[PDB]
Structure formats: structure tokens, C-alpha cells
């Protein structure tokens, strides 16, 4: 079976709005969502559908943009870095599971370049 997706709401964590978290949802997630390379990253990797039975043997911290969107909308992160770390995990999962130069890896690298361009414009803490 696929594993259940990552946790996205936790009723026992404190909640806040910050400049950075707002920007992460309204600008960074939005911009990446619409990129031509985004669709394989928009929901968890469906290892059953793709016939990739080793994916969740290899990738033990799955992450995707659907889950990040949900964490942001549910105020799951207190610090912007937690969200930034989730985007990084999503990219590195793709680099760990696949091989250098793979086309799916080039698609991740392009999304990652864009993500860094938007993170450089994060508003002041």
C-alpha cells in the first residue's frame, strides 16, 4: 500500500500569522504550483500507480507541494524555516531516489532554482 500522506493539521501546536508564512503561501507556493514542471510534485508520490515499489523503501521522509499547501493553510508551521525545510526535503527526495541528469531530476532542479529566487525575496522577519 502507499503510506498515508504527511500530517498537515495538528490541534496541539500554537498558531501564528507572520510576513514570511503569508508570502510562502501567497507567492512562493502559488508560483511553483503553476510552473510547467510542477505536476509530479503536487501530491504525494503514488508508488502503487507508478509501479515504484521501492520508493517508500528508499524515501522515508516524503514531502510534496500538496502537503506544504495544506500545512501553510492550516498554520502548521510556526517558523518559516520549517516550510523552507519541507520544500528542500521535496527536492532532495527527488535527487535521492533518482540519478544525476535524470529528466525528473532536471524538473526538480528547475523548480528548486525558482524556489531560491523567491526565497531571496522573503520579507524581513
Ligand X SMILES: Cn1cc(-c2ccc3c(=O)n(C)cc(-c4cccc(NS(C)(=O)=O)c4)c3c2)cn1
Binding site for ligand X (CB under 6 A): 40-41, 43, 45-46, 49-50, 94, 97-98, 104
Residue whose Cβ sits closest to ligand X: 40
Residue 114 makes CB contacts below 8 A (sequence gap 6+) with 31, 32, 35
For ligand X, which is the closer residue by CB, 47 or 84?
47
Residue 122: count of CB within 10 angstroms of its CB: 15
For ligand X, which is the closer residue by CB, 46 or 73?
46
For ligand X, which is the closer residue by CB, 39 or 78?
39
Amino acid at each position: 500500500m502507499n503510506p498515508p500522506p504527511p500530517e498537515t493539521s495538528n490541534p496541539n501546536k500554537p498558531k501564528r500569522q507572520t510576513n514570511q508564512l503569508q508570502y510562502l503561501l501567497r507567492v512562493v507556493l502559488k508560483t511553483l504550483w503553476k510552473h510547467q514542471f510542477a505536476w509530479p510534485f503536487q501530491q504525494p508520490v503514488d508508488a502503487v500507480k507508478l509501479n515504484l515499489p521501492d520508493y517508500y523503501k528508499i524515501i522515508k521522509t516524503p514531502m510534496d507541494m500538496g502537503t506544504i499547501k495544506k500545512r501553510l493553510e492550516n498554520n502548521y508551521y510556526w517558523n518559516a524555516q520549517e516550510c523552507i525545510q519541507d520544500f528542500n526535503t521535496m527536492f532532495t527526495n527527488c535527487y535521492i531516489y533518482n540519478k544525476p541528469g535524470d529528466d525528473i531530476v532536471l524538473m526538480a532542479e528547475a523548480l528548486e532554482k525558482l524556489f531560491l529566487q523567491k526565497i531571496n525575496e522573503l520579507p524581513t522577519e
